Amino acid sequence: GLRDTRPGDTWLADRSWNRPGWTVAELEAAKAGRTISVVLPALDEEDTIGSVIDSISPLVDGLVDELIVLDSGSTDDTEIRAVAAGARVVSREQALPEVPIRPGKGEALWRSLAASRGDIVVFVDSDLINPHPMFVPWLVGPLLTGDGVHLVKSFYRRPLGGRVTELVARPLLAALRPELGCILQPLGGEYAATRELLTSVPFAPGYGVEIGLLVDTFDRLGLDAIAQVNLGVREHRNRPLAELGAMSRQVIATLLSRCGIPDSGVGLTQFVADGPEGQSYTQHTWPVSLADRPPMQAIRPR
């Protein structure tokens, strides 16, 4: 199965693979009643976002019913450059105005549930350098085929998550939810899920949103509702070791909470070397949230 896989191949819970022999035109006919929304979380991506949107543009009005970019309060020219790419911009404020704004990616995705209409929601990051046009078709594929799959996770390859995936998320999963050891990229920003699922689960804060979702899906619906799809090659912003430490802490906090383990709520305090010889250390404490958002069905029922 994993001895030969092509960009598009689907893996089911029961160690079974499937090669997709359809087109964008074929999947659209397999919809019938069900609608697809694509959401792009964005916090200052004025350089990359244009190219991201253009790859998805031809899908709109056909397969994709609506393309939405969720603005996490960008201070640069992201808001104006997204419109010029032919995308609809919805900020956190207008996505759900009657609930106060909280920082983090988890919020953005949670708020986008209220902002979107589609029966199926697809998330794609807006910092992707050259995304392949077939990304969205590949993610929706396993959902349109009737069997009871609610969450589609993607796996990718670095060109010629990263470290945090391989050292934090995956080993911790092996320790706490061993069944999810078959997930290759648990913290993948590119994934698709049905509204029925998304609106019934709580949404983890910050960078904990993905791993929270994965575990929540597995705990309620079992492994049989989760599928994996090969995308091929992924590339985005190169995060410094300092940032990765913070993200790890949030991934830990989110995963520990989903497993009924009390997390301290104490932020990761880092010690960055000042001078060349490491003569002194600058103390840096990243914030960590243990506050989930309630299932959207509790706030604004579809």
Where does this chain bind a copy of itself (CB under 8 A)? 2-5, 157, 160, 163-164, 166-168, 170-172, 174-176, 178, 181-182, 184, 232-233, 241, 244-245, 248-249, 252-253, 256, 261, 263-264, 266-271, 273, 276-281, 283, 288
Amino acid letter, 2: L
209 annotated as ligand-binding: yes
| Residues lying near Mn ion in the complex (CB under 5 A) | 127, 236-237
Least CB distance from residue 172 to a copy of itself, whole Å? 6
Question: Which residue is associated with the tokens 């993948």?
Answer: 188
- Tokens at 296, concatenated: 């959207």
Whichever of 22 and 156 has its CB closer to a copy of itself, that residue is 156
* Pairing of the two strands 151-157 and 226-233: parallel
Residue 202 in contact with ligand UPG, rule: CB under 6 A: no
Residues in Cβ contact with 228 at an 8 Å cutoff, skipping those fewer than 6 apart = 10, 11, 152, 153, 154, 155, 182, 183, 184
Question: Which residue is associated with the tokens 């990359």?
Answer: 48
Question: Which residue is associated with the tokens 């390859």?
Answer: 157
Which member of 34, 117, 239, 284 binds ligand UPG (CB under 6 A)? 239
Whichever of 188 and 202 has its CB closer to Mn ion, that residue is 188
In what order do the strands lie in the sheet containing 120-123? 16-18, 10-12, 226-233, 151-157, 191-194, 120-123, 36-42, 66-71, 88-91
Site residues for ligand UPG per CB under 6 A: 41-43, 45, 72, 103-105, 108, 125-127, 161, 187, 189, 207, 210, 236-237, 239, 247
Please enumerate, by residue number, every residue annotated as part of a binding site: 41-45, 72, 105, 125-127, 162-165, 207-210, 236, 238
Please enumerate, by residue number, every residue annotated as part of a binding site for (2R)-3-phosphoglycerate: 162-165, 238
